[PDB]
Design an enzyme around this catalytic site. Structure first.
Site, mmCIF file in Angstrom:
data_model
loop_
_atom_site.group_PDB
_atom_site.id
_atom_site.type_symbol
_atom_site.label_atom_id
_atom_site.label_comp_id
_atom_site.label_asym_id
_atom_site.label_seq_id
_atom_site.Cartn_x
_atom_site.Cartn_y
_atom_site.Cartn_z
ATOM 1 N N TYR A 139 3.555 92.549 64.925
ATOM 2 C CA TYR A 139 2.409 91.995 64.196
ATOM 3 C C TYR A 139 2.020 90.566 64.558
ATOM 4 O O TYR A 139 0.860 90.172 64.419
ATOM 5 C CB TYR A 139 2.649 92.039 62.680
ATOM 6 C CG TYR A 139 2.485 93.393 62.016
ATOM 7 C CD1 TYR A 139 1.901 94.469 62.691
ATOM 8 C CD2 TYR A 139 2.938 93.600 60.712
ATOM 9 C CE1 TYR A 139 1.778 95.711 62.084
ATOM 10 C CE2 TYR A 139 2.821 94.832 60.101
ATOM 11 C CZ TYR A 139 2.240 95.882 60.791
ATOM 12 O OH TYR A 139 2.120 97.102 60.179
ATOM 13 N N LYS A 185 15.031 101.381 66.267
ATOM 14 C CA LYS A 185 14.829 102.359 67.333
ATOM 15 C C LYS A 185 15.721 101.889 68.477
ATOM 16 O O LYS A 185 15.281 101.692 69.605
ATOM 17 C CB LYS A 185 13.357 102.405 67.744
ATOM 18 C CG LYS A 185 12.956 103.688 68.445
ATOM 19 C CD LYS A 185 12.926 104.845 67.473
ATOM 20 C CE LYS A 185 12.444 106.117 68.142
ATOM 21 N NZ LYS A 185 13.460 106.704 69.066
ATOM 22 N N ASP A 217 12.207 107.158 63.140
ATOM 23 C CA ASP A 217 11.703 108.533 63.156
ATOM 24 C C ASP A 217 12.594 109.506 62.395
ATOM 25 O O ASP A 217 12.096 110.451 61.796
ATOM 26 C CB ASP A 217 11.473 109.012 64.595
ATOM 27 C CG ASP A 217 12.737 109.031 65.415
ATOM 28 O OD1 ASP A 217 13.407 107.983 65.521
ATOM 29 O OD2 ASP A 217 13.067 110.100 65.964
#
Lengths: 345, 345
Positions: A139, A185, A217
């Site tokens: 971001y 991740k 995920d």
């Protein structure tokens, strides 16, 4: 107990009073030593000072142990220049206080499993606290840019950033069920690896807290399939966004979602719901979020965990007996708060 | 109609024949002209050639118009060095055919809503297909690196990458309910705005397909709150990664999920379920995902949308009438297959 009260726009003032009613009562019992002052903020502040975050307020929160915010914004002030937009007041508040962790609880109070999108066996017990990083990640990371051929953005993370948020997560956990689950991740991204690595180190300092790692995920799946098995969840910025919202649809209603932002400066507690201007003043505004934001303020800012529970229980039973209009009821703001106060005794 | 059949390991060859049994049956009645051949893949090819994706096979897929893959890998080859792992065969097969779009449909079959984690009212009507871009994104973006104090990674996209995957989604929409939904984080990320504008253009090439844009965070909520309102959902790598995983829990059982990987080379159609060696041989293997994979091959590789629909429905009814063990039933593989074959007539 120095609380800076920034009611805000729309229904803000309505639900904030409701939260203040509960606090004033608890003080009349436990003798907490409350001491609050309300300050103009957001749209209200704009129409009087020409800025969403005036100095008397900027200083007011600067000297209050905690800030209880109401709502902000409204179609009236929504199209002004970014520098004075009511939303900008929130950024400027956060920034001035270096609030880097955003706490968002999702709970299926015993009895309201009906409202959850999930089946009743799976919603029964949900009470997860999503801790997210607010000041880093894809971001804000540079470089970033566009063209007619491509575009790019950089997800970057540094040790201090991950350690800070990791500590609020483990601290929060200490007050709950002592289980933390760090999301990343690490199996594909360097930053994932870096996150998993740093959290682990920080975890050493809280050996009494059960740490676990889950890829984003794989975590997206568990929140739906079996959210009840989780306590604290801590993750980076963008993933915090995705998981917070996925977690928010579990309870079944925006009006019962409190929120908080901890950091170096004064902590901020406030409901997640919008201003709801078109219902402002009519009464009938659901004060559950504000009251629960207050409960959060007691638990976090002042560490009175036991009292925070006492409050939650009271609003828990309150939602079953006198459900506010939203939950298919009649109990307006004033009536509902009363039913909370009844159980608070 | 040339199909290259790569059965695979575990229940791979069991579930694949079931699919082939149905494709033969369809070939008779409808005069298709099916022409397939089975080649060794994964562990089986390692057991015969010393590598998972040997040249004889690699030639077969290129000669073929579509590949029908089963399952791959198992304990016997997990202890092999990366370069030879059965998992590595897949990466080889995908890379070789330039497969850039991954199609993972999730659908709650009428009558089987009880398995969904969602309430029956919400989980009814779900038939969402998620298209995810495989070759771009933060997964392979550069600059990307880790140090001692910080870690970085570049989310990067280009007009060529976003255009080609978007097209597979639109083309897919036409064969479905004609609506498409792109997912991005355009409100804060430079890549998201770029993705949005680029998909918007490609969209002006299919004036019939309804196109709506949605922020990744918002979408995580919609798929839980009301998954029944979505047809084709298109998105990038990482985001596509999360959303697919999310949409997968909706049905209730991994065994009912087929998948496809379109691209410039030979498309690959295969079941999402693992090789399940612990049941490889003693019937009981639910051939649903395989048959669905075959049905997926007809619609996408050969455009027989109608005949595809026929198989989907047949299998659908077969689930209620003769549920497989893993669906609380008793029907074995051949047993089930026959009932499907009954309803194909």
């Amino acid at each position: 107990m120095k609380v800076a009260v920034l009611p805000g726009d729309g229904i803000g003032p309505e639900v904030t009073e409701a939260a203040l009613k509960v606090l004033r009562a608890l003080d009349e019992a436990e003798g907490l030593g409350l001491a609050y002052e309300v300050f103009p903020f957001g749209g209200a502040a704009i129409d009087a000072f020409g800025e969403p975050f005036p100095e008397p307020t900027r200083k007011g929160v600067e000297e209050a142990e905690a800030v209880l915010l109401g709502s902000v914004g409204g179609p009236k002030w929504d199209g002004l220049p970014r520098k004075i937009r009511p939303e900008t007041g929130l950024l400027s508040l956060r920034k001035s206080q270096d609030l880097f962790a955003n706490l968002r609880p999702a709970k299926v109070f015993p009895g309201l499993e009906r409202l959850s999108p999930l089946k009743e066996e799976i919603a029964r017990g949900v009470d997860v606290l999503i801790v997210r990083e607010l000041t880093g990640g894809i971001y804000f990371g540079e470089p970033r840019g566009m063209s007619e051929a491509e575009a790019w953005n950089t997800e970057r993370y540094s040790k201090p950033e991950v350690e800070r948020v990791a500590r609020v997560a483990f601290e929060a956990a200490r007050k709950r069920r002592k289980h933390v689950v760090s999301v990343d991740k690490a199996n594909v991204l360097e930053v994932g690896e870096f996150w998993r690595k740093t959290v682990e180190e920080v975890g050493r300092g809280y050996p009494d807290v059960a740490l676990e790692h889950q890829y984003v995920d794989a975590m997206a799946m568990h929140l739906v399939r079996s959210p009840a098995r989780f306590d604290v969840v801590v993750t980076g910025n963008i993933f915090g966004d995705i998981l917070s919202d996925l977690a928010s649809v579990l309870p079944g209603s925006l009006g019962l979602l409190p929120s908080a932002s901890l950091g170096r400066g004064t902590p901020v507690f406030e409901p997640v719901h919008g201003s709801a201007p078109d219902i402002a003043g009519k009464g009938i505004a659901n004060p559950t979020a504000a009251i629960l934001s207050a409960a959060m303020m007691l638990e976090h800012a002042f560490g009175l965990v036991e009292l925070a529970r006492k409050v939650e229980d009271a609003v828990a039973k309150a939602l079953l007996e006198t459900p506010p209009p939203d939950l298919g009821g009649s109990a307006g703001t004033e009536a509902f708060t009363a039913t909370v106060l009844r159980h608070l005794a």
